[PDB]
């Protein structure tokens, strides 16, 4: 609810890993970032092996716990956390000044970061975060 | 340059004197 984002990024049709790497770099530079339309971000590869990896992460765990997100919401934010020293002061500060959303709760339309776009016309082997979440069992609230 | 085709175009022209391409060939003579 209300997030003074210095930058609003549109993840739609964008390679998640590539977006995350830039959002991290900017959060560490002090920018407050809001990633939009997470459910529509994409990750290249063979949907079958991709899903096996994310399902394995869901099955891993124990008493100590390995809480892994299932919604495109968290999947994306965890992806970003892995690019930040979130256990350090400076790192946790950057991370906490970053938020991912389902759809776009803002009025403006996020911008599209350079090099992160995927041309659907030249690509068939890729998957949507939303699709992954649905497979993982998430409740399609988007 | 198949020889049997050449010999045919002749044999055909011979009977014309006294495959379709080969017949059209002989007619062209």
């Amino acid at each position: 609810a209300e997030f003074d984002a210095d930058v609003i990024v549109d993840a739609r049709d964008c390679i998640m890993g590539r977006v995350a790497s830039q959002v991290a770099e900017q959060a560490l530079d002090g920018e407050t970032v809001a990633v939009v339309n997470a459910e529509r971000a994409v990750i290249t590869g063979r949907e079958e092996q991709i899903v096996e990896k994310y399902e394995k992460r869901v099955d891993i765990g124990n008493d100590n716990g390995y809480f892994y997100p299932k919604r495109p919401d968290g999947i994306f934010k965890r992806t970003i956390r892995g690019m930040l020293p979130h256990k350090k002061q400076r790192g946790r500060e950057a991370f906490e000044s970053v938020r991912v959303y389902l759809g776009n709760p803002y009025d403006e339309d996020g911008e599209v970061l350079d090099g992160t776009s995927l041309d659907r016309l030249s690509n068939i082997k890729f998957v949507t975060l939303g699709e992954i979440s649905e497979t993982l069992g998430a409740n399609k609230t988007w | 340059i198949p020889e049997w085709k050449q010999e045919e175009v002749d044999a055909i022209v011979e009977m014309i004197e006294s495959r379709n391409t080969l017949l059209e060939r002989a007619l062209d003579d």
């Binding site: 016309l121 030249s122 068939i124 | -």
Partner: protein, 172 residues
């Protein structure tokens, strides 16, 4: 590579994005033709399938897109029809169309009716021991027919002896 398909006078083909729609006197069919770097478009009187790549994998899909489109042309005009025959040795098999699915009763004596839902706007007309599956979408028709035959599949017993079931008699 580039191939050009002159569309039949009986037909009209429109396409926006990755979806192509073909309409004729027999109906209409819409398909999605999506493959890396293969552009499908309607250039007035002809449909065009082209790409800058010529690798085996691309050439394969191009030829596939072609037959899919020509099949759509054929489907909207002449249409597609598969002919099937119901055959039984001891128990009279009862094949009927009920709703949007064909129901088969008393297969090999079974008390529970075997059934399958019809795909698309496929028409399954039955007359005696003969069935005729037809429609404009060859994909839908083809499956419906196949589905009907698969509906009497048996794995438990020797098929050479128990040959009851409906079979595709004529492929279009």
């Amino acid at each position: 590579p580039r191939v050009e398909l002159e569309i039949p006078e009986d037909v009209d083909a429109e396409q926006d994005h990755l979806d192509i729609t073909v309409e004729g006197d027999n109906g209409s069919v819409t398909r999605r033709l999506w493959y890396p770097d293969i552009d499908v478009s309607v250039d007035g009187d002809t449909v065009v399938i082209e790409s800058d790549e010529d690798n085996a994998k691309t050439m394969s899909t191009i030829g596939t897109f072609q037959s899919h489109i020509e099949n759509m042309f054929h489907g909207v005009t002449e249409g597609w029809e598969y002919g099937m025959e119901v055959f039984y040795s001891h128990f009279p098999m009862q094949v009927n169309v009920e709703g949007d699915e064909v129901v088969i009763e008393n297969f090999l004596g079974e008390k529970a009716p075997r059934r399958t839902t019809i795909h698309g706007d496929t028409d399954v007309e039955i007359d005696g021991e003969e069935l005729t599956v037809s429609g404009p979408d060859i994909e839908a028709v083809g499956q419906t027919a196949a589905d009907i035959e698969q509906l009497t599949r048996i794995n438990d017993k020797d098929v050479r002896v128990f040959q009851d079931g409906v079979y595709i008699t004529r492929k279009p």
